[PDB]
Amino acid sequence: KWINFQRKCYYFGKGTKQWVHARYACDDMEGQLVSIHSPEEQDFLTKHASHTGSWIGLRNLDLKGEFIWVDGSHVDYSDCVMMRGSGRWNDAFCDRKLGAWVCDR
Amino acid sequence: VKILQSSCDGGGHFPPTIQLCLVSGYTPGTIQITWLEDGQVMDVDLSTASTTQEGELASTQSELTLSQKHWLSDRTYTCQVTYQGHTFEDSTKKCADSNPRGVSAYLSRPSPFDLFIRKSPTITCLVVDLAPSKGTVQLTWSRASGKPVQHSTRKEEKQRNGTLTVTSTLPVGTRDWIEGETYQCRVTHPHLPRALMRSTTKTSGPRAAPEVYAFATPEWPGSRDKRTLACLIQNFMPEDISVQWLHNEVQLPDARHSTTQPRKTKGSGFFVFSRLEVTRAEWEQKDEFICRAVHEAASPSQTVQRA
Amino acid sequence: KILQSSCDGGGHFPPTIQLCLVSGYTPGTIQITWLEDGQVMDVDLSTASTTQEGELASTQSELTLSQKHWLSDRTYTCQVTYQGHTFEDSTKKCADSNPRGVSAYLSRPSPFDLFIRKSPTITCLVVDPSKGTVQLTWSRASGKPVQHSTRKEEKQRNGTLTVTSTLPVGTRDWIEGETYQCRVTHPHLPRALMRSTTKTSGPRAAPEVYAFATPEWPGSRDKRTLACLIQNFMPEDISVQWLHNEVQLPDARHSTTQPRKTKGSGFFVFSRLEVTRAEWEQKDEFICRAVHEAASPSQTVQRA
Ligand SMILES: *[C@@H]1O[C@H](CO)[C@@H](O[C@@H]2O[C@H](CO)[C@@H](O[C@@H]3O[C@H](CO)[C@@H](O)[C@H](O)[C@@H]3O)[C@H](O)[C@H]2NC(C)=O)[C@H](O)[C@H]1NC(C)=O
Ligand SMILES: *[C@@H]1O[C@H](CO)[C@@H](O)[C@H](O)[C@H]1NC(C)=O
């Protein structure tokens, strides 16, 4: 069911859910929220990107200030952050709902 | 997609006809809308469908008419949406009555000290009951997503004025609260006809750093050994704030220290006042009193202190 | 027709509540105003959007409310002003089939009316309607005659009648210890409801007033804040007022906290006042006056 690219498996889930509710869906389907490190990896996500927007594994802990990925790795290639239809990311509300989510394993 | 029910009149009485549902914008294509009644498909003639194209995304709205006897019979209605990926679901149910026979419940958010410094955030459900009769005050706990919860400390304190007050302290996750998780609570009583439901989450909105100001009272005729300290913490959002008093690097407990309720400023922000009484032996040993304030938008490391 | 936000599967209330929807009308300029039981709400909280469909024009307003504001049992009204008529529509939280009885509230006169204004008055606020037969009888504990009270009734938008009775009480009589009785009778109620109030007899203490000024903070230049502390006084009845150029500033400008108990016998209150650059430059003197029962001289304790 998961669409493959490079080596990592990707699932493009649909349904009106919050960032935290979309995060639980990735855990139940054995895995976690999408983490981008390579520039070529973004090109694959744009092909299956939703017009409304898809939630990405970028979040704020507030204690450090800087943004860190869901797994724990530092952000290299570029409030709960979402992904636009064009490709680029932007700052959004935590309670905000979107009809698309991306999980990776 | 979000389902919007018909509002009650001025008195609070239910209208004879109930109108529901509203579906958000999507990519143009053929859609399937099906009405459910607790896992049972309703008649297509009762609902009306209308599609409207706005810019690039397409919007559709379904309106199902229901009688007062059908809606108030305690039945959950689900709007099944079928588009590409198979199925989509959103459920709607009747609202439980508030303040039945003078019974009010209060659910407060965890203090910033427990969320950042102590790292152990807890939610307290304070329910005030004026008529203590033969029955139970069952405090059921649940999550918005459907995740399991730990057992809460259910302690009841019978007051001298003839009222019973029971509190339930639920231990919530540190990372889960900041992410945006909504914690639900259900209150039931055998004497009460309808249940009580109160739920709280992280107040998503504007963030502002608090402004701490320290003040000391001069010598007043009559008092010689005891003196009072006044503190002002203003311009901050959300209303969640922790006030601490320090002397000789050690924090002071809830005693002596008193803090007012978060009141709105003539502006955006919020303001809180702190009062502390100190003896002659305290200032002579160490003439330094630091008041610590913990906030969500506070910096550095959620710590704003003034001497 | 107003449309409220639906509850989840379990029946739990959502954190944010969204309201209102206005039907089609003849094209023209419209005015939408939000009410909270006869009180105009802030325009920033609501969002307006107009859409033209065929010949008739449709407009929709969306007001965001917290769970603590919606479940506190308060009626919201959407006032629509078009062609100089006005169309009202009210929304309320789901309630029971008319619970509890008729409640009456009798409040003591404020220290400003008792000492400064010298005209103390007692207001009897009774919350209820089947028939307009609400009687407010006045009597004294000793058996002395009383003047006629201003009986004014205000029918609320939520379907309840609220009648207030303002009785003019004596200045010297209140301090001496006179108890004023009130009788409220209704055909629906079986027993006659009676509420009476007097001067809070107990220990008396003079209030301690302290004046403080906030220094310059980065970001703010024109506006400054003034903090005042009034502590150690009994009873809880206290009047807080700010003075500038020998005249009293309006009640809307200054904010005062509820009377809280000290770690000791007494009570404490905090006062906050926001002032502009034009205020202190014209006159650099701000005095906060406190009125109390045990206050001296002549029930006036002020500090600059
Ligand atoms: C319909 O709307 C009116 C709004 O005016 C509601 O009346 C308000 O009811 C509350 C609660 O009974 C009153 O508050 C009480 O005030 C006294 C005196 O300050 C205080 O001692 C009590 O602790 C309490 O706070 C409030 O004064 C009253 N407003 C007026 C102007 O009478 C009414 O309850 C609403 N109806 C329903 C069914 O909700
Ligand atoms: C009874 O005492 C409790 C103490 O917590 C208080 O909250 C409550 O309002 C009091 N009830 C009355 C009727 O004064």
Residue numbers in the entry:
A (entry chain E): 166 to 243, 258 to 284
B (entry chain A): 234 to 540
C (entry chain B): 235 to 362, 365 to 540
What does the paper say about this structure?
The antibody immunoglobulin E (IgE) plays a central role in allergic disease mechanisms. For reasons poorly understood, IgE recognizes seemingly innocuous substances known as allergens via its Fab regions, whilst its effector functions are controlled through interactions of the Fc region with two principal cell surface receptors, FcεRI and CD23 (also known as FcεRII). The second receptor for IgE, CD23, is unique among Ig receptors in that it belongs to the C-type lectin-like superfamily. The interaction of CD23 with IgE is involved in regulating many allergic processes.
Here we present the crystal structure of derCD23 in complex with the complete IgE-Fc region, including the Cε2 domains, which in the free molecule fold back onto the Fcε3-4 region in an asymmetrical fashion. The crystal structure contains two essentially identical complexes of derCD23/IgE-Fc within the asymmetric unit. Each complex consists of one IgE-Fc molecule bound to one molecule of derCD23. The derCD23 molecule interacts with the IgE-Fc chain onto which the Cε2 domains are folded back. The derCD23 molecule binds principally to the Cε3 domain with lesser interactions with Cε4 and the short Cε3-Cε4 linker region. Despite the close approach of derCD23 to the Cε2 domain in the same heavy chain, just a single hydrogen bond is observed between His216 of derCD23 and Thr260 of Cε2. However, the experimentally determined complex shows that upon binding of a single derCD23 molecule, the disulfide-linked (Cε2)2 domain pair move as a rigid unit, swinging out 16° to accommodate the derCD23 molecule. Examination of the Cε3-Cε4 interdomain angles of IgE-Fc in complex with derCD23 presented here reveals that the chain bound to derCD23 adopts a closed conformation. In contrast, the free IgE-Fc chain unexpectedly adopts a very open conformation; indeed, the Cε3-Cε4 interdomain angles of the two chains differ by 16°. Regarding glycosylation, two sites on the surface of IgE-Fc (asparagine residues 265 and 371) have been shown to be glycosylated, and were mutated to glutamine in the construct used in this study to facilitate crystallization.
